[PDB]
Amino acid sequence: MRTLFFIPSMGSVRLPLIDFLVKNDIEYVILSRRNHVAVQREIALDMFLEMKDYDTLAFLDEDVVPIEIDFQKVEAKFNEGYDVVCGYYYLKTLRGYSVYRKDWEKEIFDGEVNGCGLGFTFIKREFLEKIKRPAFLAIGEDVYFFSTHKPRTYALSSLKAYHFIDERLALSPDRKLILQNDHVARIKHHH
Amino acid sequence: MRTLFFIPSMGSVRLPLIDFLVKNDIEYVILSRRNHVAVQREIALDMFLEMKDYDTLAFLDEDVVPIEIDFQKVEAKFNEGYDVVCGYYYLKTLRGYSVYRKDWEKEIFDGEVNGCGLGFTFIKREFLEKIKRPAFLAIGEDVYFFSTHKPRTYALSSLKAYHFIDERLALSPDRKLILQNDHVARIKHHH
Ligand code: NI
Ligand code: NI
Numbered sequence: 001m002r003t004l005f006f007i008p009s010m011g012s013v014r015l016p017l018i019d020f021l022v023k024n025d026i027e028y029v030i031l032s033r034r035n036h037v038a039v040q041r042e043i044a045l046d047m048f049l050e051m052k053d054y055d056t057l058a059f060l061d062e063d064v065v066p067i068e069i070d071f072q073k074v075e076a077k078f079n080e081g082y083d084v085v086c087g088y089y090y091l092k093t094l095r096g097y098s099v100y101r102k103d104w105e106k107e108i109f110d111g112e113v114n115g116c117g118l119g120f121t122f123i124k125r126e127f128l129e130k131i132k133r134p135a136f137l138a139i140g141e142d143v144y145f146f147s148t149h150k151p152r153t154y155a156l157s158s159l160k161a162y163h164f165i166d167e168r169l170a171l172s173p174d175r176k177l178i179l180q181n182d183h184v185a186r187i188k189h190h191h
Numbered sequence: 192m193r194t195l196f197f198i199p200s201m202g203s204v205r206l207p208l209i210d211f212l213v214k215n216d217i218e219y220v221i222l223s224r225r226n227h228v229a230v231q232r233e234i235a236l237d238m239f240l241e242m243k244d245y246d247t248l249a250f251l252d253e254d255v256v257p258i259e260i261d262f263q264k265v266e267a268k269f270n271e272g273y274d275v276v277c278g279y280y281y282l283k284t285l286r287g288y289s290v291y292r293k294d295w296e297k298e299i300f301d302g303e304v305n306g307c308g309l310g311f312t313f314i315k316r317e318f319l320e321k322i323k324r325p326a327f328l329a330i331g332e333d334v335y336f337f338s339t340h341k342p343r344t345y346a347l348s349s350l351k352a353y354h355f356i357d358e359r360l361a362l363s364p365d366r367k368l369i370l371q372n373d374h375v376a377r378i379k380h381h382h
Contacts, residue, residue, distance in 0.1 A: 002380065011358025011372075012203040015223055021377075030375045032206055033358070043374075053380040167202025167224070181202075183234075184221045186212075189193065189244040 001075040003122065004028065004054035006044035008037050009062040014167045016065045019184045024069075027054075030062070038141035041118065042134050049128065057128060061119035063164040064089050067173070070158045074122050083127035083151035086113060087120035087159030090171040098163075099155040108173065113155045115146030120161050127151055192266040194313065195219065195245035197235035199228050200253040205358045207256045210375045215260075218245075221253070229332035232309065233325050240319065248319060252310035254355040255280050258364070261349045265313050274318035274342035277304060278311035278350030281362040289354075290346040299364065304346045306337030311352050318342055 005021075005028035007013070013021075013030060021028060029047060031040040041059065048057040056078070060066070066087065074085045086099045088108050096104030099116040118141070127149075128135070137144050146153065162170035162178060172178045196212075196219035198204070204212075204221060212219060220238060222231040232250065239248040247269070251257070257278065265276045277290045279299050287295030290307040309332070318340075319326070328335050337344065353361035353369060363369045 004378070009206065012205045013209060014203045015200065015221060018204060018209075018221065027378050027380065028376070029378070030206060030209065032372045032374050051378070051381050053382050181223045183223050185219070187195070187218050187220070187242070189218065190242050191244050 001055050001071065001078070002027075002053060003056040003058045003071070004048060004051060005058045005060050006031060006041075006048070007060050007062050008040040008044075009033065013062055014164055015182075015184045016162070016164060016167075016170070016180045017062060019182070020065050022184065022186045036138055038136045038138040041136040041141055045128060045133070045135055048125075055125050057123045057125070059118045059121045059123070061117075063092075064119045064161045065164060065170070066120065066159070066161045068158065068160065070156070073156055073158050077154045077156065078122075078124045081152060082154045083124055084153040085122040085159070086116035086153060086155040087161055088155065088157065088173055089120055089161040089163040090173060090175055091117070092163055092165060092171065105155075108157045108160075109155065110157045111155060113153050115142065115153055116155070118142045118145065120159065123151070192246050192262065192269070193218075193244060194247040194249045194262070195239060195242060196249045196251050197222060197232075197239070198251050198253050199231040199235075200224065204253055205355055206373075206375045207353070207355060207358075207361070207371045208253060210373070211256050213375065213377045227329055229327045229329040232327040232332055236319060236324070236326055239316075246316050248314045248316070250309045250312045250314070252308075254283075255310045255352045256355060256361070257311065257350070257352045259349065259351065261347070264347055264349050268345045268347065269313075269315045272343060273345045274315055275344040276313040276350070277307035277344060277346040278352055279346065279348065279364055280311055280352040280354040281364060281366055282308070283354055283356060283362065296346075299348045299351075300346065301348045302346060304344050306333065306344055307346070309333045309336065311350065314342070
């Protein structure tokens with residue numbers, strides 16, 4: 001499985017996300033600011049669909065920094081017939097976690113869900129090639145996407161991320177505040 | 192010649208600089224926020240001196256985005272016995288260009304200068320291994336560095352950069368405002 005990350009930005013990327021991108025050899029498109037995030041997500045879908053080497057479109061909000069991604073567990077869920085695999089981070093709205101059934105979840109679990117906020121979310125090509133386009137419309141384009149297109153959706157507890165508030169302080173998946181203030185290096189020849 | 196870029200940041204990097212970093216296969220350390228830029232520059236010097244595979248410490252401010260770098264012209268100047276090679280961008284203070292003799296220069300030229308603002312600046316190891324440490328102290332650590340350590344310093348007109356004001360709008364080296372609002376991609380498999 002080959003994944004292309006699309007990161008909606010406001011024109012910059014915080015260091016902790018740069019570090020994740022470098023350390024994990026991630027392939028991505030960081031989207032410059034547009035009128036609204038829904039417009040960026042539609043652009044992402046358009047670009048993704050043309051880029052046939054990529055099997056999975058991963059949306060990652062610029063303030064969401066994965067702790068670990070078990071890509072084989074994500075791939076396993078798609079193979080089993082899920083359309084969308086959701087990861088967990090705590091919302092900056094303080095309303096709960098980034099996945100929902102009847103409401104934003106209060107606790108992390110592995111299970112089928114109704115949707116998520118599109119901030120840490122893997123979507124398979126097969127599903128996206130079938131959906132009516134344009135696909136994201138803005139409540140948000142997140143509830144719209146799920147309510148309208150009804151993907152078979154699974155939340156993995158093994159997908160966890162920090163949700164950064166500023167460049168250094170983040171909400172951790174254990175609902176604590178953490179601080180990450182390290183430098184970020186891309187060095188190929190420190191022998 | 193192998194160059195390690197040190198980029199003092201406030202915890203994020205604007206897209207246009209990410210694009211420069213990716214497109215040009217740059218090796219770097221982006222420095223997280225500290226008390227003051229002088230502290231970041233000293234940390235940079237300490238790290239650089241230990242990393243013996245790197246011949247040149249390049250400082251690049253996070254809001255400075257090179258247009259072109261002729262690395263062979265930089266290397267040529269070091270071979271000729273310069274210690275520091277300075278590039279040009281227009282200051283956001285609007286006072287002139289980033290290099291000075293008696294004052295900030297009003298026009299771009301190839302020639303020996305007294306110093307620059309340390310925002311687009313290549314410094315050779317030989318010089319840095321000789322200087323009294325600690326080396327940067329904050330007027331700024333830029334005038335201090337040059338006034339105190341008196342490197343043999345050359346400004347190359349072939350080193351030009353944009354000086355970004357926000358994430359998209361920049362002062363160009365021709366003293367005009369330009370806008371860069373493209374997405375930034377790192378994609379290895381668009382076949
Ligand atoms: Ni090497
Ligand atoms: Ni390939």
